[PDB]
Amino acid sequence: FACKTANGTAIPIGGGSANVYVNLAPVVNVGQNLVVDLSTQIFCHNDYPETITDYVTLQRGSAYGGVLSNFSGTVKYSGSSYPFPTTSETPRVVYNSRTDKPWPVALYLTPVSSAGGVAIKAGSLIAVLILRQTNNYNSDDFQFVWNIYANNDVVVPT
Amino acid sequence: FACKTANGTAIPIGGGSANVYVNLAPVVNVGQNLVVDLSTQIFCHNDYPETITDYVTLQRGSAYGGVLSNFSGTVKYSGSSYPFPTTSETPRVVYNSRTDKPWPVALYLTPVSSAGGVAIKAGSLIAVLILRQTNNYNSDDFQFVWNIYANNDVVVPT
Ligand SMILES: CC(=O)N[C@@H]1[C@@H](O)[C@H](O[C@@H]2O[C@H](CO)[C@@H](O[C@@H]3O[C@H](CO[C@H]4O[C@H](CO)[C@@H](O)[C@H](O)[C@@H]4O)[C@@H](O)[C@H](O[C@H]4O[C@H](CO)[C@@H](O)[C@H](O)[C@@H]4O)[C@@H]3O)[C@H](O)[C@H]2NC(C)=O)[C@@H](CO[C@@H]2O[C@@H](C)[C@@H](O)[C@@H](O)[C@@H]2O)O[C@H]1O
Ligand SMILES: CC(=O)N[C@@H]1[C@@H](O)[C@H](O[C@@H]2O[C@H](CO)[C@@H](O[C@@H]3O[C@H](CO[C@H]4O[C@H](CO)[C@@H](O)[C@H](O)[C@@H]4O)[C@@H](O)[C@H](O[C@H]4O[C@H](CO)[C@@H](O)[C@H](O)[C@@H]4O)[C@@H]3O)[C@H](O)[C@H]2NC(C)=O)[C@@H](CO)O[C@H]1O
Ligand code: NI
Ligand code: NI
């Protein structure tokens, strides 16, 4: 089991960490959501699907920086919605093919009423999402840690 | 502050996520209404009412599946109606007793004029409703995320 990003970086068998940059709507008002869909950027696969079934959760999602200070959020994982920052590890998604399959995570972020001006700075860390991978074969229990960075400033009109 | 569902589950203090399985009118003709009344399904309480006032909004409601594609409608929250899918967070409802009190959310849906046949597939996701809870006591700001599923097919006769 391993994963890769659309930009080209990889996290190998056994887990690790990577940095992912995301494009953000540059202007967001109270009542609107910024949608950060990581399923177009993070892809994983099972390396021995004939003999092993891989199980993949969103172990935790955390907010940083301007997302932590200026937004409230939800996360959608494989069709179900949860608070973001997260309160518990999600149910599992099965990975059962050598063909890359997206990691089905998307953030929905909405400004709090005190947000205004530059609420998320370009290049800043906005979130950490921890993918936990186990299987039905041995004791492997690995973390793939995705550090999510903004490409651009996000402004909340005042 | 925490919440529970009928014959069901709980989302504890600090928020979280749950699935709610709802029975739906099985036959809804064009021009008839499908009401999804969550006030019989979702109940909340204040855990320290002698000292704290809890405030609860419908921060967002979103449609999925056959409700998104085959119905149009509104959401009523505590006596007032609003567009559904929602465009703004609602006014607050006060919770001030340890006795379970309903969350006063209902969807009022009507088939689109081209709908016919199976318009809501049994077991499918129909809505996500985000309950936001704050108080007059500390900085708590917690999301209770309700993933709403149809227990049965809804047919629009032709
Ligand atoms: C006359 C007067 O008011 N005197 C003050 C005391 O009331 C006060 O004691 C507070 O009282 C509040 C109730 O109003 C209690 O708050 C609840 O705490 C629950 C958790 O308590 C446990 O965990 C704490 C750490 O998590 C720990 O410190 C405690 O000892 C307990 O083990 C919490 O679940 C609850 O919140 C839920 O419920 C409400 C109501 O529905 C929701 O609004 C919330 O969102 C959440 O769902 C609520 O917070 C305090 O436990 C109690 N503290 C103590 C030590 O007894 C004291 C202390 O004030 C606290 O300390 C000050 C410094 C400040 O930080 C306050 O915010 C704290 O409550 O002060 C007296 O003067
Ligand atoms: C009929 C039959 O197959 N009988 C079995 C043999 O299959 C079995 O041989 C093993 O088959 C398993 C697959 O089920 C292999 O498991 C993977 O091993 C690789 C690493 O393998 C390389 O490294 C091994 C030593 O480290 C070498 O022996 C081997 O030759 C290779 O060079 C792991 O990377 C895999 O795990 C990764 O992928 C899975 C799936 O995505 C994830 O779940 C993991 O978390 C991890 O990301 C598997 O562990 C194993 O290599 C095969 N062994 C050999 C020698 O070929 C044989 C051995 O016990 O037993 C017979 O009964
Ligand atoms: Ni591989
Ligand atoms: Ni209670």
Residue numbers in the entry:
A (entry chain A), B (entry chain B): 1 to 158
Structure paper excerpt:
The FimH type-1 fimbrial adhesin allows pathogenic Escherichia coli to adhere to glycoproteins in the epithelial linings of human bladder and intestinal tract, by using multiple fimbriae simultaneously. Pauci- and high-mannose type N-glycans are natural FimH receptors on those glycoproteins. The lectin domain of the fimbrial adhesin FimH from E. coli recognizes with the highest affinity and in monovalent fashion oligomannose-3 and -5 N-glycans. Hereby, we describe the conversion from monovalent- to bivalent N-glycan binding to the FimH lectin domain, with two full N-glycan structures, namely α1,6-fucosylated oligomannose-3 (Man3Gn2F1) and oligomannose-6 (Man6Gn2).
